[PDB]
Amino acid sequence: MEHVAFGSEDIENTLAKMDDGQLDGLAFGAIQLDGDGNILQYNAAEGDITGRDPKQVIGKNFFKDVAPXTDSPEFYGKFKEGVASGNLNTMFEYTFDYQMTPTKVKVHMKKALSGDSYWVFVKRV
Template identity: 45%
Template sequence: MGDVLCAWCGALIGQSGVDHSHGICRSCYRELLRIPDLSEEALDGLPFGVIVLARDGTILAYNPAEGALAGREPSAVIGRHFFTEIAPCTSVQEFQGVFREFCERDDASRTFQFTFHFPGGPVQVQIVFLHRGADVAVAIRKRVDPVA
């Protein structure tokens, strides 16, 4: 039995073997599920990264927290293609493949871990996909290191 930490906030969820939602605690998950209903202004105020992608990968929104994480100016990336122009490290099955799959399904969310290869070095992140109308909101947070 080991401690299970929330992959989003780092809070102790419980012990392994105990039922939990995607490795994310209930209160974080509830917050994440609100993202599709938030205005772009509200998205900009969130403390973690959010990118809204059209199904073809065009960036529709990119909040300042994601800009800070990736070292990019949101205004410089909106309207460009995420997988080919902005984050080519994501044009792999583990990210773009999951994205395509998610677009075809009705699942409320999809959660997985990924490593971004930023110019400053690799950054391990937790990713949550959510449907936002016909588009997809991608919530991104630096992974909380498990306490040894």
């Protein structure tokens, strides 16, 4: 286990440039998106929560392709606002239900330190 808590105040500094292997050590799901929502990183904990294969989703668009249930004002809308402002930091509960058993989660979206990069962190609730 990497010793990082979900929702930690400095999470973007701790995860900065974490390689795919180290990201797989987190206790929570972690996705890194570009500003358009394309998947740059996707860890093992997230694949366990959602069923997706962390290796296969990289390069897919999260909102258009992988997670259409998040293509809504309550998820994608918040993401694209926070990308626009360059200050994204939002935590909210949500239900993931596309081609899966509906699963309620807590989501934390936060701008990364790397260019054109945004984290989506996920844990079960």
